[PDB]
Amino acid sequence: LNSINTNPGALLALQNLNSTNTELAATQGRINTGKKVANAKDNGAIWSMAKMQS
Amino acid sequence: LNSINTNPGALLALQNLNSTNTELAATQGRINTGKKVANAKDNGAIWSMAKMQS
Amino acid sequence: LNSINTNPGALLALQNLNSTNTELAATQGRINTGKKVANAKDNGAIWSMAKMQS
Amino acid sequence: ATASSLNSVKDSLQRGQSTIDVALAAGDTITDLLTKMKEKALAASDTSLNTASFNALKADFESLRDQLQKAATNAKFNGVSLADGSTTKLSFLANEDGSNFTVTAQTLSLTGIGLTATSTFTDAATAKTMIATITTSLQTATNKLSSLGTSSVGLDTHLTFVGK
Amino acid sequence: ATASSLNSVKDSLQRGQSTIDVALAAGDTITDLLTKMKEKALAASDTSLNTASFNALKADFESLRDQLQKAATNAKFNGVSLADGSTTKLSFLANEDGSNFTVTAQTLS
Amino acid sequence: LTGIGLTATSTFTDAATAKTMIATITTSLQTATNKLSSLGTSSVGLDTHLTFVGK
Amino acid sequence: LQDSLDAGVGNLVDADLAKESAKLQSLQTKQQLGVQALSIANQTPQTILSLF
Amino acid sequence: LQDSLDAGVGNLVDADLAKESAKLQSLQTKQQLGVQALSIANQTPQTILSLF
Amino acid sequence: LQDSLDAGVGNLVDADLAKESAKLQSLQTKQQLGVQALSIANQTPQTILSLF
């Protein structure tokens, strides 16, 4: 706990900030694209389904 | 992730904005022309049939 | 290392700061001109091509 | 002593890039001058023009070439120049032992781009011949400025390496 | 006498580090000139260019080549270098008995 | 200056003469520095001999 | 043909500012980070003063 | 493709600065602790004067 | 033209203050270390009184 070499709590806070940044990037993609399934990485089954539909 | 030299998310958002701008340019072009096949680039076969019938 | 006369590390940081400063200068030039090839110093061959075409 | 001697190499390199900047600033005007003379020769190529418009375009060409020669002769910094043709080249320090960083002069004066001080056009055919020589002068001028700019980028790179 | 002799090995390793830093400073420019030369030759390969554009690309290519040879010649540290090709290797002190820490030269000419 | 390779009137009068003078000034600084190194070694030997004379 | 020539000159010289604004902000961050790093490098030598 | 190659270079060389901030503060503390430990090791021998 | 001459005089004359700040701080640290060394040199004679 009382260490100058390392601190777990800063690592956990950075992990949580990275998760928030990833959620913000996904929100940016959904906003600028207008689609919740914009590509095959989003969800492949419904993506190929809508591809054949189009 | 927490890079200061390059940010991929801005690149992806700019690609989406360029796609939207291209679709808007095609829309304004076929609005001002009044034709969905205004030239050979739009569809060369339909343009050929239409020019021969004309 | 433990020198009262000269320290290499501040010189290295000064070179890195000068590098980011000249990159910011190129950024300001591309912004205030609007061209990536505003003059012969940027790229002489493409500049001559653009001058002949203009 | 070898380290302290490099400040002269650096300030000479900076004076050299400043002279390059002055020559490029003059060439930026010389190119537009050549372009407008090309447009005037193309306009004077017409056989349908009345004589009055022909003398008018000829007067524009005279004033244009005179302004080109003046802007070419005004391009100098600290008493030296790489555009007026007064010298074939200028050298600047590149190392503490006295090695030089040569920068060839690229004349931008009227005679250096294939134009004479008297060159004009008298009839439509002379303007039609003038079109191609003005295009060649614009081409050689842009090539000279491209060489000057590449020399400037090399000067900057050598300055950075000398600082390292 | 051994502990006193080690100072020369320390100074020799520091001198070799400074020489390698000079060689790296020259290579940082040689790599950029090679990248721009690849750019110029690659654009020059296009057949749609008119002759004047090809001449300008050729002039830029030759100018960058001469600048690359210049940057290769300027790499040296107090009369010795690992990049200009003047020598095959430098033998740096590694212990008090005279054993050497060889560093092979890498010509950048 | 006579021991340093310089004359009392030594002087460049032209850019090429100054470029030739650069190597002369370098050789002069080098020989002067070697002379000072010899003086320092002689002074260290003098101090060593003084300590031995005291012993 | 004149419109095509102008479009080609614009394709040759014009910069993509939408790319450029992100580069501007990132360099503005890197500048402050470099100033802070140079300040810490300047602060480093003085710690030896405590030993005397 | 050019965007993908630039993103790959950024993944390959860029530092994760958010960890570097905590590393910087921890090293700034360790440096002062090291100077104090060196000063104590310096003062330790001098106690021999008391026995004479 | 006048702009180019002003920029050239600025290149010939102006100093790089970012290096001057480091020069200044290292010179202050050297001045304090030298004042302490002068104090030690002044205290060197003091042992002579112990002889009598």
Side-chain angles (χ1 to χ4, degrees):
Chain A
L1 200 171
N2 278 300
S3 190
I4 63 184
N5 286 326
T6 187
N7 62 6
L11 300 157
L12 300 159
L14 164 74
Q15 294 177 12
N16 286 151
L17 182 60
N18 285 319
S19 177
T20 308
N21 279 338
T22 300
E23 214 173 353
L24 189 59
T27 306
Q28 277 164 27
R30 263 177 326 270
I31 288 178
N32 69 17
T33 293
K35 295 150 64 153
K36 64 182 181 293
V37 178
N39 50 67
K41 293 187 286 185
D42 279 340
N43 172 343
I46 310 159
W47 173 90
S48 44
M49 269 163 44
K51 182 63 70 177
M52 319 297 306
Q53 294 264 333
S54 295
Chain B
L1 282 198
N2 320 107
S3 164
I4 70 174
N5 307 301
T6 62
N7 62 6
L11 288 172
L12 289 178
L14 177 48
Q15 297 174 9
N16 296 141
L17 176 59
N18 297 7
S19 168
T20 284
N21 268 335
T22 303
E23 182 65 26
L24 185 51
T27 305
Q28 75 193 27
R30 66 185 183 273
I31 278 158
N32 68 40
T33 300
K35 302 179 164 80
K36 54 150 181 273
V37 175
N39 60 42
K41 285 178 294 150
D42 283 346
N43 187 339
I46 309 300
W47 175 91
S48 308
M49 313 189 227
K51 197 157 280 303
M52 303 299 297
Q53 294 179 357
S54 277
Chain C
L1 282 72
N2 289 120
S3 199
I4 201 54
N5 289 325
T6 187
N7 80 357
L11 300 158
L12 289 194
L14 191 48
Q15 312 168 348
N16 295 339
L17 184 47
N18 291 339
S19 158
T20 187
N21 280 317
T22 187
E23 280 179 271
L24 190 45
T27 299
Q28 183 60 243
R30 277 185 298 271
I31 285 156
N32 62 7
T33 300
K35 288 173 202 224
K36 61 182 181 253
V37 185
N39 63 7
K41 296 183 290 294
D42 307 328
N43 185 339
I46 297 169
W47 175 83
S48 296
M49 297 185 207
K51 275 288 180 83
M52 288 324 276
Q53 204 174 120
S54 296
Chain D
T2 302
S4 63
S5 284
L6 286 183
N7 312 303
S8 297
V9 170
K10 293 187 286 185
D11 56 37
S12 305
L13 277 174
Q14 285 147 342
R15 165 161 28 90
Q17 39 177 24
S18 303
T19 300
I20 301 299
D21 280 351
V22 173
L24 281 156
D28 283 358
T29 300
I30 297 169
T31 61
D32 300 3
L33 267 163
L34 286 180
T35 304
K36 302 183 73 203
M37 292 183 285
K38 184 178 184 293
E39 316 194 8
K40 302 271 154 213
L42 183 63
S45 158
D46 291 331
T47 80
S48 313
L49 297 193
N50 42 59
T51 300
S53 66
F54 182 107
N55 319 101
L57 293 155
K58 183 178 184 293
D60 303 271
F61 182 79
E62 315 297 358
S63 179
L64 268 166
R65 64 179 176 87
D66 291 331
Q67 294 177 177
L68 187 153
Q69 165 66 75
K70 182 175 73 175
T73 192
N74 292 123
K76 67 184 289 184
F77 171 99
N78 199 92
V80 298
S81 185
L82 295 156
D84 55 2
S86 54
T87 180
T88 48
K89 67 181 178 67
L90 293 160
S91 304
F92 320 94
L93 300 185
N95 195 59
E96 61 86 20
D97 59 332
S99 185
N100 294 308
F101 197 105
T102 312
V103 176
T104 314
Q106 300 282 336
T107 318
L108 283 171
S109 66
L110 269 175
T111 69
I113 62 170
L115 286 175
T116 62
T118 308
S119 46
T120 61
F121 48 91
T122 309
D123 69 313
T126 311
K128 175 135 175 193
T129 300
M130 195 68 201
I131 292 185
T133 187
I134 287 292
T135 318
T136 300
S137 66
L138 186 49
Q139 183 62 255
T140 187
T142 61
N143 290 327
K144 292 181 181 180
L145 306 152
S146 175
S147 296
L148 286 172
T150 307
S151 296
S152 177
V153 188
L155 271 157
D156 308 337
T157 296
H158 195 63
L159 187 53
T160 305
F161 160 90
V162 171
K164 300 294 187 291
Chain E
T2 317
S4 59
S5 289
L6 275 189
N7 295 284
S8 288
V9 173
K10 291 174 70 175
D11 271 330
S12 182
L13 305 178
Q14 264 165 318
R15 158 154 65 270
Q17 276 174 273
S18 296
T19 309
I20 291 158
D21 299 3
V22 182
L24 290 179
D28 275 358
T29 61
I30 297 169
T31 53
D32 291 9
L33 301 160
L34 275 171
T35 313
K36 288 190 280 183
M37 275 162 60
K38 182 175 174 66
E39 182 65 26
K40 300 294 187 291
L42 188 153
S45 68
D46 184 31
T47 72
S48 67
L49 288 173
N50 58 24
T51 290
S53 307
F54 181 100
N55 296 346
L57 288 169
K58 184 177 180 180
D60 266 15
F61 187 97
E62 283 145 2
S63 314
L64 309 174
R65 159 201 74 201
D66 294 333
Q67 293 179 356
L68 188 153
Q69 183 66 93
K70 186 180 289 293
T73 61
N74 296 115
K76 65 179 73 175
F77 186 71
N78 290 318
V80 289
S81 179
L82 294 174
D84 67 339
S86 43
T87 194
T88 76
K89 69 214 204 167
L90 306 168
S91 277
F92 292 162
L93 274 47
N95 212 34
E96 61 86 20
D97 69 344
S99 296
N100 302 267
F101 196 119
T102 307
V103 176
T104 304
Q106 312 294 336
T107 314
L108 286 190
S109 80
Chain F
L1 291 90
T2 65
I4 302 299
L6 276 183
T7 61
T9 61
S10 66
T11 289
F12 64 91
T13 61
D14 190 65
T17 307
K19 185 176 180 180
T20 300
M21 192 84 192
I22 297 169
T24 306
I25 301 299
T26 300
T27 300
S28 66
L29 170 62
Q30 177 78 75
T31 178
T33 289
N34 302 346
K35 274 182 190 253
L36 290 169
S37 172
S38 289
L39 294 186
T41 317
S42 296
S43 84
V44 171
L46 276 166
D47 293 20
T48 307
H49 193 57
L50 182 62
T51 316
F52 166 89
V53 171
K55 299 291 180 68
Chain G
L1 159 76
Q2 177 162 45
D3 289 352
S4 301
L5 294 190
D6 280 328
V9 170
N11 301 340
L12 277 155
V13 295
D14 283 325
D16 193 4
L17 298 168
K19 288 246 172 163
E20 185 59 20
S21 66
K23 292 177 71 68
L24 168 79
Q25 278 158 300
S26 299
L27 291 181
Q28 267 155 357
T29 313
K30 197 151 145 193
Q31 195 204 27
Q32 315 288 348
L33 294 194
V35 186
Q36 288 195 39
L38 168 65
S39 179
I40 288 147
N42 294 339
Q43 295 298 109
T44 300
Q46 287 69 60
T47 68
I48 195 165
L49 211 60
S50 309
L51 314 160
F52 304 84
Chain H
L1 183 63
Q2 180 186 75
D3 279 340
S4 288
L5 293 144
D6 266 342
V9 165
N11 295 347
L12 203 53
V13 288
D14 279 336
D16 169 356
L17 283 192
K19 292 181 181 180
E20 310 284 359
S21 66
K23 298 293 183 182
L24 173 54
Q25 303 204 252
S26 309
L27 297 164
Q28 293 179 356
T29 300
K30 185 183 286 185
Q31 183 195 57
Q32 295 297 109
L33 307 184
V35 191
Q36 291 174 51
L38 172 45
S39 189
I40 297 169
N42 269 1
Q43 274 160 16
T44 300
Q46 315 321 312
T47 75
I48 193 66
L49 275 194
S50 296
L51 315 159
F52 295 86
Chain I
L1 162 55
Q2 174 186 39
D3 179 341
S4 288
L5 282 53
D6 276 337
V9 175
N11 296 115
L12 276 55
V13 176
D14 284 340
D16 186 74
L17 285 146
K19 186 180 289 293
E20 313 290 341
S21 82
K23 281 158 181 223
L24 174 48
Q25 211 184 314
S26 66
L27 285 166
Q28 318 203 309
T29 314
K30 190 166 217 263
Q31 181 183 210
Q32 309 183 27
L33 183 63
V35 171
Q36 207 149 354
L38 177 46
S39 66
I40 297 169
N42 288 305
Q43 282 318 102
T44 55
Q46 210 57 252
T47 81
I48 297 169
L49 277 296
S50 306
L51 294 174
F52 309 87

